[PDB]
Design a protein around this motif. Structure first.
Motif, PDB file in Angstrom:
ATOM      1  N   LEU A 318       4.909  -0.793   7.034  1.00  0.00           N
ATOM      2  CA  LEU A 318       3.672  -0.048   7.127  1.00  0.00           C
ATOM      3  C   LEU A 318       3.962   1.413   7.305  1.00  0.00           C
ATOM      4  N   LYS A 322       3.305   4.563   4.621  1.00  0.00           N
ATOM      5  CA  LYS A 322       2.389   5.475   5.237  1.00  0.00           C
ATOM      6  C   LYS A 322       0.991   4.908   5.309  1.00  0.00           C
ATOM      7  N   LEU A 323       0.916   3.635   5.673  1.00  0.00           N
ATOM      8  CA  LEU A 323      -0.336   2.943   5.831  1.00  0.00           C
ATOM      9  C   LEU A 323      -0.518   2.412   7.225  1.00  0.00           C
ATOM     10  N   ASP A 324      -1.754   2.306   7.660  1.00  0.00           N
ATOM     11  CA  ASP A 324      -2.004   1.615   8.907  1.00  0.00           C
ATOM     12  C   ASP A 324      -2.426   0.183   8.604  1.00  0.00           C
TER      13      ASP A 324
ATOM     14  N   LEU B 111       1.123   4.634  15.093  1.00  0.00           N
ATOM     15  CA  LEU B 111       0.861   4.933  13.705  1.00  0.00           C
ATOM     16  C   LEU B 111       0.535   3.683  12.926  1.00  0.00           C
ATOM     17  N   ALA B 112       1.213   2.580  13.221  1.00  0.00           N
ATOM     18  CA  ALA B 112       0.894   1.356  12.517  1.00  0.00           C
ATOM     19  C   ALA B 112      -0.549   0.962  12.799  1.00  0.00           C
ATOM     20  N   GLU B 113      -1.009   1.177  14.031  1.00  0.00           N
ATOM     21  CA  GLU B 113      -2.384   0.816  14.338  1.00  0.00           C
ATOM     22  C   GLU B 113      -3.342   1.778  13.637  1.00  0.00           C
ATOM     23  N   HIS B 114      -2.998   3.055  13.637  1.00  0.00           N
ATOM     24  CA  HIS B 114      -3.736   4.074  12.920  1.00  0.00           C
ATOM     25  C   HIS B 114      -2.899   5.323  12.798  1.00  0.00           C
ATOM     26  N   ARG B 115      -2.788   5.863  11.591  1.00  0.00           N
ATOM     27  CA  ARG B 115      -2.000   7.068  11.417  1.00  0.00           C
ATOM     28  C   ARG B 115      -2.795   8.300  11.772  1.00  0.00           C
TER      29      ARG B 115
END
Ligand SMILES: Nc1ncnc2c1ncn2[C@@H]1O[C@H](COP(=O)(O)OP(=O)(O)O)[C@@H](O)[C@H]1O
Lengths: 379, 327
Positions: A318, A322-324, B111-115
């Motif tokens: 992820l 560059k993704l959530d 970041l994985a949860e939200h960037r």
């Protein structure tokens, strides 16, 4: 002749055919849709598939598996040098290219990994031909997404040796995405995470699909994590029990271990459905019959870290893509090991309850997708 | 709109918020604890209590609270951005304690949860700091000397690529070794990597302005590339340090003639001169284009315009590169 697609793994393979509007998955002679990627050089015949897997008990130095770990590589390649140390067969340097040495009909012979693969592909060809009632050369063969160029060409050549018209080489996650109809969105969507927990390896990748065009944005994985190490933890559980009951450690007895391990695999499959499995082996060690059991909960405890570790490559992919998590539109399960409820639970928790795409058996989806693409190439 | 206990938790949340606006950490904790018990399936009360512990410097407590909030948010299907914030704050405790390697680990989870843009920037700061700490830890002048010496053994045999590899390890180990930069420069000059000779010679020279050899190595690369105008200037800087120096004097004298003898075809002049951004600017600037047209048509335009340095030096640069010839 109907086009086919072949799912070529390190421990297993599967062939699909596209006919009469749909993909059929073709069971081999033992009734197995998915058959072992094993070749056994016995002193009477070259066996392929289950016929070969069942001989590991008798001629292990002459059987082969994990051809893909050697395919496309140089002999001096660190991967080759490391992995050979864990095999019963000998890897030979022939022009700085590994060749595998076995004794066949009493003779010393060595075959390139590509030759071993072609033998496996030939068997898959025979399965498809017998099923369909006619010779088939039109085929699509999949490869891991991390394969390099030498590896893809080597795979294609194995098909050429087998006698196939290799129409195409497809990365394994693309084939899965095809199988699940993700090339029919009609949108710039979707970002799809494909989780392949296979036999000897764990391959995670993110494919972004834009109206039928696929791009691999990221890969992550573990080259020494797959279903085999779950079976290995299961072996240690049963060996320890045997030891406690008989005051005998059977882990040093290769025949006892191969038979125990085979039973362990069966118990693991049993537990992907039931919450209990039996261990039933006659004369497991020094004439001792070993009868015991394991429950699903116990299996998960033995392997609790193996299961948790599968999420670290997910986080890595992820970030590299560059993704959530919110940006993943779909989650696809590939590999027979994803049938284990613990895996499914971890992905759902990791992804906050998002459904996993199981519409196609996870160990058929790649063959399935390859068959679909093969059908397209031929029509 | 809300279950009574959710609304009650909200009223307490709001009072807790006002207590924090005033930096009343402890009154606020009381309000959030009530709010937490009133509506336990809600990370916001837990993360707010953590905010106090972070501000107080009580990083271990704020970390426990963030972790609990994360587990709760997942159980209760809360927004991925809420989960991300809890992780971002965990990374912030490590950032504040200067544990940048851990700050990064937790920011990666965030970041994985939200960037989140804030995490992206803060984690970049954590990386920059940690990377500098790692280089400083790597530096060891004695290991640099051993790699330098092996590089020298290779260099002296004509094996410049191997010497370069050892010199590279030596510089990672000792960044101010001016002599080492010039030894790499030499490898490049011999291998016709004249451009790389120039960059390592320039760092050598700034580190040690009197290192005449840094200048002769640079100038030789410039002369070899037919950049005689700068080669002469670099060799001259070497002469300024020592007027008796052989390469500084001899390379200087060769450049002195060669810088004119090479002009040959105007195509050589255009390709070389226009490689230099300064003359590209002179030509791309329409004011200069107009001045140049007047100059071609009237030698007196030159006589007058060249009295002002802003133009005279733009013209001098075009003459130095050979674009403007004067007869
Ligand atoms: N029904 C099942 N339940 C649980 N595990 C299974 C089942 N069927 C097969 N497996 C396991 O799945 C793996 C097969 O991997 P495979 O799907 O061929 O992937 P790959 O070819 O990419 O390695 C083996 O570890 C095997 O024991």
């Amino acid at each position: 002749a109907a086009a086919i697609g072949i799912d070529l793994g390190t421990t297993y393979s599967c062939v699909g055919v596209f006919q009469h509007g749909k993909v059929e998955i073709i069971a081999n002679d033992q009734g197995n849709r998915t058959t072992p990627s094993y070749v056994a050089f016995t002193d009477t015949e070259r066996l392929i598939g289950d016929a070969a897997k069942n001989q590991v008990a008798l001629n292990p130095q002459n059987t082969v598996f994990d051809a893909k770990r050697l395919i496309g590589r140089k002999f001096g390649d660190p991967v080759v040098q490391s992995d050979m140390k864990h095999w019963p067969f000998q890897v030979i340097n022939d022009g700085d290219k590994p060749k595998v040495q076995v004794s066949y009909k009493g003779e010393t012979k060595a075959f390139y990994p590509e030759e071993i693969s072609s033998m496996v592909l030939t068997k898959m060809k025979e399965i498809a031909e017998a099923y369909l009632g006619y010779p088939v050369t039109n085929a699509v063969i999949t490869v891991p997404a991390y394969f390099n160029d030498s590896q893809r060409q080597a795979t294609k050549d194995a098909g050429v040796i087998a006698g196939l018209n290799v129409l195409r080489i497809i990365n394994e996650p693309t084939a899965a995405a095809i199988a699940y109809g993700l090339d029919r969105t009609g949108k710039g969507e979707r970002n799809v995470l494909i989780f392949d927990l296979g036999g000897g390896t764990f391959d995670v990748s993110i494919l972004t699909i834009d109206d039928g065009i696929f791009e691999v944005k990221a890969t992550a994985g573990d080259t020494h994590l797959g279903g085999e190490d779950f079976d290995n933890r299961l072996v240690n559980h049963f060996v320890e029990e045997f030891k406690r009951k008989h005051k005998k450690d059977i882990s040093q007895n290769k025949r006892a271990v191969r038979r125990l391990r085979t039973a362990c695999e069966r118990a693991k499959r049993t537990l992907s459905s039931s919450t209990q499995a039996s261990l039933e082996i006659d004369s497991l060690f020094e004439g001792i019959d070993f009868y015991t059991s394991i429950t699903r909960a116990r299996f998960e405890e033995l392997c609790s870290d193996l299961f948790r570790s599968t999420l670290e490559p997910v986080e890595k992919a992820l970030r590299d893509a560059k993704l959530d998590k919110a940006q993943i539109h779909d989650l696809v399960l590939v590999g027979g090991s994803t049938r284990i409820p613990k895996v499914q639970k971890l992905l759902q928790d990791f992804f906050n309850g998002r459904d996993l795409n199981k519409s196609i058996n996870p160990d058929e989806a790649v063959a399935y997708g390859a068959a679909v693409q093969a059908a397209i190439l031929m029509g | 709109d809300l279950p009574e206990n959710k609304k009650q938790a909200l009223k307490e949340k709001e009072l807790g918020n006002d207590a924090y606006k005033k930096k009343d950490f402890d009154t606020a904790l009381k309000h959030y604890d009530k709010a937490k018990e009133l509506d336990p399936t809600n990370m916001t009360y837990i993360t707010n209590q953590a905010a106090v512990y972070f501000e107080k410097g009580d990083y271990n407590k704020c970390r426990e609270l963030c972790e609990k909030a994360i587990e709760v948010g997942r159980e209760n299907r809360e927004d991925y951005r809420q989960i991300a914030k809890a992780y971002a704050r965990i990374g912030n405790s490590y950032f504040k304690e200067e544990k940048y390697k851990d700050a990064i680990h937790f920011y990666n989870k965030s970041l994985a949860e939200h960037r989140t843009p804030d995490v992206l920037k803060k984690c970049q700061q954590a990386e920059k700091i940690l990377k500098e700490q790692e280089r400083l830890a790597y530096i060891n002048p004695d290991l640099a000397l051993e790699e330098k010496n092996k590089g020298n053994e290779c260099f002296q045999k004509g094996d410049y690529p191997q010497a370069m590899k050892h010199y590279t390890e030596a510089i990672k180990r000792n960044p101010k070794d001016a002599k080492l930069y010039s030894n790499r420069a030499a490898c490049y000059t011999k291998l016709l990597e004249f451009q790389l000779a120039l960059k390592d010679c320039e760092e050598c020279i700034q580190l040690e302005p009197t290192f005449i050899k840094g200048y002769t190595r640079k100038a030789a690369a410039l002369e070899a590339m037919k950049d005689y105008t700068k080669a002469m200037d670099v060799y001259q800087k070497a002469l300024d340090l020592d007027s008796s120096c052989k390469e500084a004097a001899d390379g200087y004298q060769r450049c002195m003639m060669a810088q004119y003898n090479r002009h040959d075809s105007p195509e050589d002049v255009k390709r070389r001169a226009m490689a230099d951004p300064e003359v590209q600017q002179i030509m791309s600037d329409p004011a200069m284009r107009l001045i140049l047209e007047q100059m071609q048509k009237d030698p007196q335009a030159l006589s007058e315009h060249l009295k002002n340095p802003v133009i005279a030096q733009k013209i001098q640069k075009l003459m130095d590169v050979g674009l403007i010839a004067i007869r």
